[PDB]
Amino acid sequence: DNQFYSVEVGDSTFTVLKRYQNLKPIGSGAQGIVCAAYDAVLDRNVAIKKLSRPFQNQTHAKRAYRELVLMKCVNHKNIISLLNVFTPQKTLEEFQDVYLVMELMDANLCQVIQMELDHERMSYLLYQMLCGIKHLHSAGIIHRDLKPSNIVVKSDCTLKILDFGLSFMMVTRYYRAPEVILGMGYKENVDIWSVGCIMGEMVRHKILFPGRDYIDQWNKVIEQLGTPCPEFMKKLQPTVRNYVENRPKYAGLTFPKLFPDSLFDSEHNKLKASQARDLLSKMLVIDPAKRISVDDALQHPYINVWYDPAEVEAPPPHTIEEWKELIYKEVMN
Numbered sequence: 001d002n003q004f005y006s007v008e009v010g011d012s013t014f015t016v017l018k019r020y021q022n023l024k025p026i027g028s029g030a031q032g033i034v035c036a037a038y039d040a041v042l043d044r045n046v047a048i049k050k051l052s053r054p055f056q057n058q059t060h061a062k063r064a065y066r067e068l069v070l071m072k073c074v075n076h077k078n079i080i081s082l083l084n085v086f087t088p089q090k091t092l093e094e095f096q097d098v099y100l101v102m103e104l105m106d107a108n109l110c111q112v113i114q115m116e117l118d119h120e121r122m123s124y125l126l127y128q129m130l131c132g133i134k135h136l137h138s139a140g141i142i143h144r145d146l147k148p149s150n151i152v153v154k155s156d157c158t159l160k161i162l163d164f165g166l167s168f169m170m171v172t173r174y175y176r177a178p179e180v181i182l183g184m185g186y187k188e189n190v191d192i193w194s195v196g197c198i199m200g201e202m203v204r205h206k207i208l209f210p211g212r213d214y215i216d217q218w219n220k221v222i223e224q225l226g227t228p229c230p231e232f233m234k235k236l237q238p239t240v241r242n243y244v245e246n247r248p249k250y251a252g253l254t255f256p257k258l259f260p261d262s263l264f265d266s267e268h269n270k271l272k273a274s275q276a277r278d279l280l281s282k283m284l285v286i287d288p289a290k291r292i293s294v295d296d297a298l299q300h301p302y303i304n305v306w307y308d309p310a311e312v313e314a315p316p317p318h319t320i321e322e323w324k325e326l327i328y329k330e331v332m333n
């Protein structure tokens with residue numbers, strides 16, 4: 001196919017449409033390799049993600065298929081939007097790779113976490129994550145795995161969530177809600193805990209709960225926030241309830257102690273620091289029955305200054321062989 005050309009990207013070969021030029025590797029993960037490129041047709045820089053045989057197993061396949069479908073069943077500036085999708089392969093028999101194209105972003109939220117932000121930028125980023133999550137919820141999509149490596153930003157402070165969230169692979173749990181860690185039921189505000197973890201990390205410049213596994217994760221949570229109420233214990237399955245109730249007890253630390261003044265000059269900034277800590281205290285709540293909702297977070301004074309109805313109330317959205325065919329059909333449309 002004359003429309004495509006191949007480029008060497010590390011150990012991988014990127015076979016892309018000739019419109020994408022000066023391919024440069026910008027990162028990789030378990031799912032695929034990402035390049036920056038110049039799109040000569042749009043006269044814009046783009047990010048190109050290659051999915052190598054996404055149908056290779058149930059985990060890669062479910063994710064690739066669910067993401068391809070959801071990216072069409074979603075329309076919001078704080079959620080990933082595709083510019084293009086293609087395969088260099090001509091037939092289902094030859095089908096191997098899927099290439100996804102979107103606007104090139106400047107940095108991920110990890111990089112943003114490593115810097116000091118003022119309250120306008122910090123509140124604007126959090127407002128955008130909430131707008132993004134609210135849009136997902138309105139379509140019945142509850143993320144459950146928001147993390148800063150899957151959130152990208154531009155120099156103008158605009159933000160996008162790259163994925164749609166939630167089993168053997170031949171993964172980052174730090175932002176997962178207690179009700180996800182403990183196999184409890186969950187509602188929309190499961191995503192509010194992850195936003196709290198991210199916000200807390202934006203302020204501390206350190207992962208709040210850096211667990212090597214779910215056991216370690218649960219200990220780091222209780223060591224800082226304290227042992228949850230008996231009413232929370234009442235919602236756990238007997239086995240999880242016995243394990244959680246037999247863990248070493250902790251009174252927990254107060255939010256001024258957790259996020260000291262040292263982490264936050266002018267009167268404006270003093271008031272905003274007070275409001276940021278109040279919002280952190282409402283999101284970083286173990287019990288989802290007592291944790292603030294996405295709607296109430298958007299009405300919080302720290303966030304409310306950015307409130308725009310057009311952004312908050314935007315119009316709402318197998319075997320290896322079967323997955324191969326389902327993914328191929330989605331790519332071909």
Ligand SMILES: CCCn1c(C2CCNCC2)nc(-c2ccc(Cl)c(Cl)c2)c1-c1ccnc(NC2CCCCC2)n1
Pocket residue numbers: 026027028029030034047048049080100101102103104105106107108149150152162
């Ligand atoms: C590669 C850096 C960030 N990124 C990732 C990561 C996410 C965490 N796991 C590893 C990959 N996926 C995409 C991405 C996700 C979905 C699609 Cl469809 C496309 Cl094409 C790209 C982008 C990205 C997206 C846009 N711009 C950028 N820009 C980089 C530039 C260098 C600094 C980090 C951000 N990365």
Ligand SMILES: Nc1ncnc2c1ncn2[C@@H]1O[C@H](COP(=O)(O)OP(=O)(O)NP(=O)(O)O)[C@@H](O)[C@H]1O
Pocket residue numbers: 028029030031032110147148149150171172207
């Ligand atoms: N906020 C963080 N601070 C520091 N290190 C982190 C943080 N989050 C994740 N990491 C590390 O960054 C590395 C990449 O993590 P991650 O982006 O979650 O994986 P991934 O394969 O790129 N995800 P995906 O694209 O969804 O398949 C791992 O070594 C993590 O332990």
